[PDB]
Amino acid sequence: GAGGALFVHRDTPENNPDTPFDFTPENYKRIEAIVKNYPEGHKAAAVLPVLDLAQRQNGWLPISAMNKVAEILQVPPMRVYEVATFYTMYNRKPVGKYHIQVCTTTPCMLRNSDSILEAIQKKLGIKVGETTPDKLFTLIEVECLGACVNAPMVQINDNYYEDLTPKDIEEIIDELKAGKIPKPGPRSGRFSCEPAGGLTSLTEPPKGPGFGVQAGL
Amino acid sequence: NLIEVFVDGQSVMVEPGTTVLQACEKVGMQIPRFCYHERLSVAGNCRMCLVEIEKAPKVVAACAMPVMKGWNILTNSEKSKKAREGVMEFLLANHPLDCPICDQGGECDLQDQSMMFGSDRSRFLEGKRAVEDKNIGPLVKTIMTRCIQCTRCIRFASEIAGVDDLGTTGRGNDMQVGTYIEKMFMSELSGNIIDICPVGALTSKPYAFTARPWETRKTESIDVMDAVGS
Amino acid sequence: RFRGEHALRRYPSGEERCIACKLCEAVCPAQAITIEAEPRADGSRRTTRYDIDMTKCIY
Amino acid sequence: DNSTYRNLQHHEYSTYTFLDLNVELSKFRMPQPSSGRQSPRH
Amino acid sequence: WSSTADPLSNLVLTFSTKEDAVAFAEKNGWSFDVEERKVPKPKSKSYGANFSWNKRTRVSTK
Amino acid sequence: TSFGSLKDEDRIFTNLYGRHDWRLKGAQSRGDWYKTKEILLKGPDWILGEVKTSGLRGRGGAGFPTGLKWSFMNKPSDGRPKYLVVNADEGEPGTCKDREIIRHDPHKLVEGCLVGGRAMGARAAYIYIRGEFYNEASNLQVAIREAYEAGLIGKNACGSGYDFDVFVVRGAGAYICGEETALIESIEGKQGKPRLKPPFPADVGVFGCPTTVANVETVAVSPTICRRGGAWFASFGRERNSGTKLFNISGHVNHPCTVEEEMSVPLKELIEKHAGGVIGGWDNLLAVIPGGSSTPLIPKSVCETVLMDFDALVQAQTGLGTAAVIVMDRSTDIVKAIARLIEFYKHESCGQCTPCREGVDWMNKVMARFVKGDARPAEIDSLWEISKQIEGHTICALGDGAAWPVQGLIRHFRPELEERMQQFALQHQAR
Ligand SMILES: Cc1cc2nc3c(=O)[nH]c(=O)nc-3n(C[C@H](O)[C@H](O)[C@H](O)COP(=O)(O)O)c2cc1C
Ligand code: SF4
Ligand code: SF4
Ligand code: SF4
Ligand code: SF4
Ligand code: FES
């Protein structure tokens, strides 16, 4: 299945090197804290954190933001473009306020993840790669997100909503559009990856310090 | 001091750090390649140079694997031949049918190495990939559907010409080579990417369609446009 | 299958089929074909000279 | 008590939580090693 | 068409050795200019140099 | 001898399920950060010997002797920095154990980083965490700040005179960047394409310095092994497969969960006990993938008597991998599931080298035709051949892991492929 997103840039009035972008002073402090996590002479190691910070500030990554990151880090703009186009978490196009990312890999596909996707599509009236007319919600499919035992699940702006049902995801979307922030985590009454029937392990209080310590150690 | 390696059982003394490709070159065997250039850095991505070591269950990239003492390199073994055939099969599976309309024509490394090391038949029953063409100036014509993503132009551009405007955007089968922006790769050493590109993706624009390699007569002279004496 | 006088064909749209690839010139036993080409006004790979010496051709 | 989820601190984080934590950790760090040059292009 | 009046325009001979070619030219009486064979000089290659800690051989892309 | 029924007094990863406090106070209420200074004073050789005696193997895929790897990195200094890179790019489909460790035992992770760094003589440890786990990374940073404030890490760590730093690097979404050399390339602000070996990471790693890449579970279980023995850890498990393991049972199972068990527990017992068994009962089982997408599948016949173990699963034409147990019951489209896995591999392909790039796209297309029967039985052997041409001829192991599920499907469910092709031929010929 084709992604539908191109990997070439055409200048537009809404996206061109003259688009105004610059880091806030707080973000410049964050950048200067980030850069010195790496040895001297290897400032290029901060490309991913600085680009992520730029995306967090601006909402997405224009070519002006890419050029600004390249100028700040003294790295080639083509290298910045390579990183931005390689990594899929970077938005090179404007997205909605809430970026729903439904995981559709096999462990999530075995459970009714297609039901979750269809419920989202009917609730918002958009396709699997479109954005709501009020620029409020964007819906995409993604690969495994690391919460397979809590399938099916979605990610909406670095928050995991797990053990979902169509009613649960519809309620989450309603809460998001109302203004409230839903609590991330499983929606089936579980707190974490524990079995739903009951704890089959770690049922007794943990042993204290120095429990099975070696003689010499 | 020199270490003794073996190519097809023939002894050869090579300096430490010498590669399998260079050992075969010393014994007179040119291992097939698409991404390896001796003037450029080692990439090891086209995977065309895979050869078999006598006791190694796994094939090694001859362009990037330093030889060890007492290594026997089986250049014409069944595993090496099958590896070359598979790599060429992938290359031609995604390559386009442009040979007659392509200026690379009879001087193409893909054609020659397909005739010498690859199979004579295709098992690809799917559709092919078509790539949008870029524009990097009035000298180099780009038809990027023929690119095999060998990164010779990128490495040459950066290392030799000191210009870092070539690279790969995207990933996977959709990985593309270009500038990602409408930028002309203008430099005094821009035609050497035409030379080093093994395929017709990068071709001379002034020379386009004019002739074919077998017709041309070669006159070995020198250059007068400057005082280097090229 | 009869081999008589030569002809250059066209596509049904009227465009010439020949793409100046010089395979016929390369394969001609008697070297009866002379071909010279260049990019056209619209950028097509088309011939400017396509000669066949019918007194040299062996048909 | 082993019946309450104690990992509830993460329903408060914001966009810059990770980077603010990184900024706070700056004081505790140690001097970085140097390659002897400002950049590989130098 | 391209005309010619030189019989030896297309004549190219193949020899296994510079000495053999020189002997043939001398016994056939033509003048000759000899060009010494140019072989590429050996080059030291290393894939690990692409990631040097302190040298300029570190590459910015792969 | 039998294996399983691990005791809570012996489970390494307490606070799993997040039912206790994960802070420094909560971790210190358990055995975390106990005599760490004494371990550091005992030094590198003692820690390496303890790990070797424990016989721990890599917990993030290919199981290699961690003692051997850290001894590889135990060479004398040559004027360059030393780094431990902790892999937390849990991109394998089926795996959540690293997420649980990071979110619930970050101090265990940090103590393991310190112990491993002392063993390897490392100045710093970069924990490369995937960008989707933002809350997990934030909890990890909070725990690291607590450790720095308490003086457990930093200069004069634990009051031992050893300087050791712990940084957290958040990546973007790249299952290929999950790979160790791609991890290293991504840390350096590059695309994240795996390198060729040699040079090995223990000699030329991130920034060109000696680095050792180790899994979150491995480094987290290191300090527990150090404080305890390693005769104990070797006692848990088979002879060459020792210790405990985190299993993520998911899919068509009654109770999908993450649990800790012994390294040779039978798969049937694990599923029936910690996961409630298959949804329609054990007789409703169709196939199981025991190590995530990379490992092939096994039918119910193999799953009836098999041990969740490295060698045991190798003898079953499979692999343990990350011990991610995906269960598929009789009422599933196995061809569609394997095709979705292959599509995942097509999307999560770095595209650097020709075999994996072109062949994985080709296999994705062939499988997409297979799931609807729009193919011929003569293409099954062709698909097997192209999968074998991908495997072993690639720069990294993603190409190999993209062919093993195809090989497993072709090996165990060829009749289903042929029957679906026959059904499609009947459907289209009726027109
Ligand atoms: C979270 C994680 C993801 C990994 N993903 C991949 C992958 O996509 N491809 C691959 O070939 N190896 C992958 N690996 C394996 C690494 O290449 C390497 O073997 C491992 O990180 C070393 O850790 P260990 O010594 O604890 O096994 C992964 C490892 C981990 C821990
Ligand atoms: S690059 Fe080579 S193989 Fe490709 S169309 Fe041109 S001549 Fe043919
Ligand atoms: S354009 Fe040519 S030289 Fe550049 S990567 Fe493609 S095939 Fe190689
Ligand atoms: S050059 Fe000759 S062979 Fe080629 S397209 Fe023209 S007529 Fe055909
Ligand atoms: S096998 Fe695939 S993911 Fe690995 S280096 Fe090659 S192209 Fe990249
Ligand atoms: S398969 Fe969906 S979270 Fe892993």
Ligand code: FES
């Ligand atoms: S020539 Fe060695 S992999 Fe390309």
Ligand SMILES: [Mg+2]
């Ligand atoms: Mg060319």
